[PDB]
Amino acid sequence: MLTYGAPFNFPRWIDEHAHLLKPPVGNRQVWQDSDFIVTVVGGPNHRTDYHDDPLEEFFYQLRGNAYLNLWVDGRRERADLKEGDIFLLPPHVRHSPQRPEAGSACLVIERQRPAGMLDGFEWYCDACGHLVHRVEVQLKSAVTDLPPLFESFYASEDKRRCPHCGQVHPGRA
Amino acid sequence: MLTYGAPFNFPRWIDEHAHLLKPPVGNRQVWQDSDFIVTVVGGPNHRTDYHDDPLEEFFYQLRGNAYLNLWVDGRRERADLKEGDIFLLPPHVRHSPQRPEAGSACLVIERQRPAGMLDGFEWYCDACGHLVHRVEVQLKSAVTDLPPLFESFYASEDKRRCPHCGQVHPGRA
Numbered sequence A, B: 001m002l003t004y005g006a007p008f009n010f011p012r013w014i015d016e017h018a019h020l021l022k023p024p025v026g027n028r029q030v031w032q033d034s035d036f037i038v039t040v041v042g043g044p045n046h047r048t049d050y051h052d053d054p055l056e057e058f059f060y061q062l063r064g065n066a067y068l069n070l071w072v073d074g075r076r077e078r079a080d081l082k083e084g085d086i087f088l089l090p091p092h093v094r095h096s097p098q099r100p101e102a103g104s105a106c107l108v109i110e111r112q113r114p115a116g117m118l119d120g121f122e123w124y125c126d127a128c129g130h131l132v133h134r135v136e137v138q139l140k141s142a143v144t145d146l147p148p149l150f151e152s153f154y155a156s157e158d159k160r161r162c163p164h165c166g167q168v169h170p171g172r173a
């Protein structure tokens, strides 16, 4: 009835899964089929998508440094996750995690979205800042529903084309 | 729109709130009015009540050692939270945290219970193991609704009297 197992040493768990906390994978969920989605995210990794999580996200940067590109008060802002920092992100704050360092490790905790509560993923234009593309997803498993989504955005000039100034978003990088 | 503030160094936050992570207080919530209830629990502290959380609880023992008295498969079991351990408790697993050491620090994460989802608190008989008393609570703030509850149990021989063998539960210790 300990559905998720006995306690276990977290530093050794992170050491042991080092090879998963690098490209191409980068992150690894700790427990399966739980309400709390508990993930360790490594590096390096950069991304252009912004996430619209309808729930809160908890961050604890155990190893290395990272940062969150945000949209707060309509203005682009950056929040640093220095090694040792903890942080709670309010629901719906657009965020784009940048993880420049190898060997970094960040604990991220979220919960399973209830049916009908959708995650959004959006890109914004470097030229005029308008919204470029947005996909909403009933997010049941990030590693499975998200890659195909990001890929169809990079593959389509149409999706990448800003409706305000015509600039075509660079895509992946 | 960063409702819960910017990131901040967690070890220094724990050092700075040392005096709250001792008796009589013992624990301290990190953010107010959030869906994720994020608590640091110190020591020393022992307790006889078992908690019936209708949701999951995440534990990360950053400093020192602790342990959880449990009821699993009807049998009394113990789960150690050695320094560095992480642990996810499934919903409704009865648990009684024992925190014998001063200077220990454990990160506990839960979420606000929705209306109608009740926490239970129960005591069991050292003589025959039957259930002795159970209070259900719409738990809106632990530090406010729980002390009066525990106190009314210690103050009442009636509540402390086992319905199976008549043994009167010791109460607080």
Ligand SMILES: Nc1c(C(=O)O)ccc(Cl)c1O
Pocket: A027, A039, A041, A057, A097, A098, A099, A106, A108, A110, A142
């Ligand atoms: N913020 C993240 C990250 C991240 O911090 O890059 C990785 C996976 C998931 Cl599910 C997240 O919510």
Ligand SMILES: Nc1c(C(=O)O)ccc(Cl)c1O
Pocket: B027, B039, B041, B057, B097, B098, B099, B106, B108, B110, B142
């Ligand atoms: N397990 C705990 C503890 C604990 O680990 O003693 C303290 C406060 C809260 Cl709200 C908890 O759920």
Ligand SMILES: [Fe+2]
Pocket: A051, A053, A057
């Ligand atoms: Fe996210």
Ligand SMILES: [Fe+2]
Pocket: A125, A126, A127, A128, A129, A130, A162, A163, A164, A165, A166, A167
């Ligand atoms: Fe544009």
Ligand SMILES: [Fe+2]
Pocket: B051, B053, B057
């Ligand atoms: Fe609890």
Ligand SMILES: [Fe+2]
Pocket: B125, B126, B127, B128, B129, B130, B162, B163, B164, B165, B166, B167
């Ligand atoms: Fe008894």
